[PDB]
A = this chain, B = another copy of it.
């Protein structure tokens, strides 16, 4: 039926205290997790309506409330819990960041993935010190309910550059796709959140996040990341879709004239993207004619690259029934179930 590839479980900073190494544990006990936020005030908060659990705190913080509202509410075969901790990549201390990710991966294993069969996990790593991220991927990637690695797209340079390759080597060797998720662009020591620098308000910052993915993606393709690690899968989570055709054409046209500068590439850039990359659908783009979005998919044979997600319980939550309704049934099968069942090797 349905696999949701982006479900944000949440937790009080103090939920990680039992899993944190010293000195980082004492830090969090005294001040919470030193997240270095983007600094763009959204007024509609982040969460949707009536997702705050009974008695609980943050929306998404109660496994039982989420089994009910999401797993059985919308009949989901599997849900990939992606948490929020990958955002710590924006902070300044590489060891603090890795230690927080390490404690979260354990917490997720101990307290979430065993509470339902549908529950699967993205392991989080910090990108400031890619060597520590490789360690964590090898430490914990073997767990049978851990199906991918989650990275923030708030980095210190384009993600295709060699400083990061230890992460791709480790994930590809383990068979774990690398998911990339926005949220922290511009915070702490990451790069400016848009090519033109820092916008003034949240609506600009949010709209522009897709452009970070385009930059990172051009870097990963042209730096030959997929030539160097032919087993790598990259999943672009929550960054839009409709921009991909134009990027594909622009990048292919430049490649035709510029191939000699990038000789490790032996097929067109668009084919590397199609063969190695996936994109989640949330927040689904809404042309006035919904048929248009589908026409866009078909223009670049992207039905095998698209993964449904709800992004429960955020304000732009996508219920599966209302998304992509004019899709052929065989394409709807692929985007709602089969692409992800294959990608994560589920069942």
A161 at interface by CB-CB < 8 Å: yes
> Of the candidates B44, B242, B246, B260, which one forms a contact with A210 in the assembled complex, judged by CB atoms under 8 Å apart?
B246
A159 at interface by CB-CB < 8 Å: yes
A249 at interface by CB-CB < 8 Å: yes
In Å, the complex CA distance between A159 and B283 comes to: 27
In Å, the complex CA distance between A195 and B2 comes to: 34
Query: A28 to chain B: which residues have CB within 8 Å?
Result: none
CB-based contact A44/B219 at 8 Å? no
> Of the candidates B194, B207, B246, which one forms a contact with A254 in the assembled complex, judged by CB atoms under 8 Å apart?
B207
A101 at interface by CB-CB < 8 Å: no
Query: A155 to chain B: which residues have CB within 8 Å?
Result: 196-197
CB-based contact A242/B245 at 8 Å? yes
Interface bracket on A: 35 or more
- The distance from the CB of A305 to the nearest CB of chain B, in whole angstroms, is 15
Query: A219 to chain B: which residues have CB within 8 Å?
Result: 196, 199-200, 204
CB-based contact A196/B212 at 8 Å? yes
A30 at interface by CB-CB < 8 Å: no
Interface residues of A in 278-317 (CB under 8 A from B): 283, 285-287, 289, 292-293, 295-296, 299-300, 315-316
Closest to A42 in B: B258
Closest to A43 in B: B261
A65 at interface by CB-CB < 8 Å: no
In Å, the complex CA distance between A257 and B286 comes to: 13
Q: In the complex, which of the residues A191, A196, A202, A214 has the most CB atoms of chain B within 10 Å of its own CB atom? A: A196
A33 at interface by CB-CB < 8 Å: no
> Of the candidates B44, B158, B199, which one forms a contact with A197 in the assembled complex, judged by CB atoms under 8 Å apart?
B158
CB-based contact A207/B44 at 8 Å? no
A240 at interface by CB-CB < 8 Å: yes
CB-based contact B245/A240 at 8 Å? no
In Å, the complex CA distance between A295 and B315 comes to: 32
CB-based contact B253/A286 at 8 Å? yes
Binding site for B on A (CB under 8 A): 42-44, 153, 155-159, 161, 185, 191-204, 206-208, 210-212, 214-216, 218-219, 222-223, 240-243, 245-247, 249-255, 257-258, 260-262, 283, 285-287, 289, 292-293, 295-296, 299-300, 315-316
